[PDB]
Design a protein around this nucleic acid. Sequence first.
RNA 1: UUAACCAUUGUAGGCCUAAAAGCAGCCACCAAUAAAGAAAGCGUUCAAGCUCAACAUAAAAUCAAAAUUCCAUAAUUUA
Lengths: 142, 80, 76, 154, 156
Amino acid sequence: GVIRSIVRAGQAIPGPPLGPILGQRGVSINQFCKEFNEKTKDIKEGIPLPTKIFIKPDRTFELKIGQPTVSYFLKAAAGIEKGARHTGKEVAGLVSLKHVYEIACVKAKDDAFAMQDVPLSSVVRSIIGSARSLGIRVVKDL
Amino acid sequence: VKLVRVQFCPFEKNVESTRTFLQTVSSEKVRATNLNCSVIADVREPCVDVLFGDGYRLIMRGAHLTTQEMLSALASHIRD
Amino acid sequence: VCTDPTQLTTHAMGVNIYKEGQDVALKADSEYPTWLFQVNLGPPKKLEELEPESREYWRLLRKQNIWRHNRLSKNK
Amino acid sequence: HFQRQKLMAITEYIPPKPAINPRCLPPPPKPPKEESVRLLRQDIVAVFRDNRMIAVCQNVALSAEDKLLLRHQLRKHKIFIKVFPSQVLKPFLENSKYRNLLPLFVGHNLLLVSEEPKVKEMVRVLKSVPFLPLLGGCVDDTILSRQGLVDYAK
Amino acid sequence: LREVVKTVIEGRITETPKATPDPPNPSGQCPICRWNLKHKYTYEDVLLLSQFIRPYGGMLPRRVTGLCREEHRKIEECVKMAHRAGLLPNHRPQLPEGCLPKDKPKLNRYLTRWAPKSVKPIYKKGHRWNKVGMAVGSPLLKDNVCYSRRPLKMMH
RNA sequence: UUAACCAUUGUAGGCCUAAAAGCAGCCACCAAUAAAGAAAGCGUUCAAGCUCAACAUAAAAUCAAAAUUCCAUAAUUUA
Ligand code: FES
């Protein structure tokens, strides 16, 4: 069973959001955090990362991780830590077009998230769509 | 069911019943249920043979048989 | 992190931020292929904007078809 | 009053009886067919024309994202998984280079479209999963079986 | 027509007898339409009904018969009435292994719209202005040709 | 319209929410794909998770005729 979490690498033992949820199926909680900590060392601490753990009925761990989230980065790029209540029309930061593409190039390196598409139109739309989810407006140039 | 053998000839006149039946046999959910089964696509008139360890062997030809009848007959054998 | 408009527009601050990877500078516009900066930066292609002979047109139309059922399903 | 009730019945309209009911009617003309679906024609026409040999293997309930990865995996093999809904696949022969491949394209199965005679690359795809029924590749757009594919994939 | 022979079991599709040539009314979408039999068959016409019924009295699928839905409902009702009237001795229900019928006297009945089992007795018949009516016949067969001066009394 | 089948990946997307990931609130509302709703009813310590819509593959086509004791008997076709 594929379980996906976005928890930040900085803290490998959040508790309820990861530990018992995986435990309910029946797994070793300590093992999950240790491997997550191993990923934490390679990556910067305190940045959300998507994981694709598969909990099979055999009580096994299949941990897969990818490029750091572009949703949190766009918030960081916009200088926003906590967004507006709605964010549908509220905007606190503007992202230039040049900045948009630079991050997209690095994004196209993982084997997960479908980061192998030759055209960059797919990549930009996802981050453009992500920006719409955030309280950020993506302007061509500012 | 330790082994299930399904074959048919696309180049020659190929019966859909056996082809559709093979797809059900070669299904991830179906394979998990009969985990003991060793699946093989002998596609290359159609003859279907299923081999059991106890020695019971059922041979089915899909030329005159619909896909459902094979599924019902083979599925019943699974319970044994 | 960078907080300078000149550096922001002349250096790729967001390309890499890790400790092992240092912020790389931005090359000239001509040094990249034209398609890099020619990608669709505008709003999502609407059914009018979408070309009837493009796959995206029907793919989004199917999404719109799903929307209609969802709207009906929500009311039920 | 009794008489007043008689008037109400009289107001009932008398309808004539049709000669034949619609179900039991003689076969009448029907509205002309219209190609709605038309876009998908170009996509299949281009890919089939581009790729001479089309290896075929009934999809084993594969997920959509896996196909994206498999598309990239074949890109390593210089092949593409270009597939489209099969309802518009059947009219492909109606408006395309060939008209006689309809029986071969019976059912909804994976289409592996390759333009280059890289036999080793094609087989390697076959080596990933053999259990799914692999009909075979229409080498040079000619009907072939699974064993026939091997006999002519060379 | 596919029959299964029986472990290894093999099934053979066999040719079926064909309908008599030259239907009275060609161009008919349904066999009843083809034969001009829309309004001239009744439950007593077992010969016509038997063609569409399984050997043990089961109804055959409409798609195989090819007749339109209107006749399907009419034929099904006609067949059910014949069974309840004991007009189909060769299509009686199958005995599973060794079971035997009620082995009790069977009352002769005909023109039965519904099963006798599920019809409760009418204890209160009613007065002249409150008389209760008992349905006889089937509404599906209203369109059938009537040779009487006035339409038949469906409700007794 | 309404009968069978299936359900991938981005992003657990931003919001006071411990956490709420389609599905507590709250948002706007894009991509890839052949086909996936930035979610429709379910499940919800939160999620995993149940299906509906997705795609493929079925097959269809304007209302009727309360307490003493049931209460004529019956009855569908010869003009
Ligand atoms: S008599 Fe023609 S469809 Fe029934």
